[PDB]
Amino acid sequence: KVFGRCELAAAMKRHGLDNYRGYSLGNWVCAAKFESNFNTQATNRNTDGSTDYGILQINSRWWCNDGRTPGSRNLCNIPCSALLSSDITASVNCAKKIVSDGNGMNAWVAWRNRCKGTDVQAWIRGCRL
């Protein structure tokens, strides 16, 4: 599923991500934009052989099982495929765990390089929220 900007912001709110660990909804929409271009089916294979999945490009080294990341963990207790669903519930539940892990949203390199410190509110501007 490819979400519209306001559509995703709505879904993120409905699932409790808005101001989660102090990060406003715009932060989460921005991160989703640059990680997946709002496409739930986004995947990216890394040099280390791990793979990133879903709207928030959650990575198989720690967070989900895909059966092909030697030495990895599955801290979200989910198959990585669940992160590709049209329903973002699994992605959001997992993102809550990742953003709680110590480094906030810096866990998402694209958030740090393209969203952090910017006018993130622009991402939710105009949306009926």
Minimum Å gap between C-beta 11 and Pt ion is 8
* Residue 52 designated active-site: yes
Residue 61 interface partner, choices Cl ion, Pt ion, none, CB cut-off 5-8 Å depending on type: none
Instruction: Say which of 7, 18, 48, 52 is annotated catalytic.
Output: 52
Quick check: 39 binds Cl ion (CB under 5 A)?
no
Quick check: 87 binds Cl ion (CB under 5 A)?
yes
Asked if residue 27 lies in contact with residue 47, where contact means CB atoms within 8 angstroms, the answer is no
What is the C-alpha to C-alpha distance for residues 128 and 13, in angstroms, rounded to an integer? 11
Question: In Å, how far from its chain's centre is CA 39?
Answer: 11
* Residue 35 designated active-site: yes
Quick check: 13 binds Cl ion (CB under 5 A)?
no
**Which residue's CB atom is positioned nearest to Pt ion?**
89
Quick check: 69 binds Cl ion (CB under 5 A)?
yes
- Write the interaction track for Pt ion spanning residues 86-115; mark x where CB under 5 A is met and - where it is not: ---x--------------------------
- What amino acid positions are annotated as catalytic residues? 35, 52
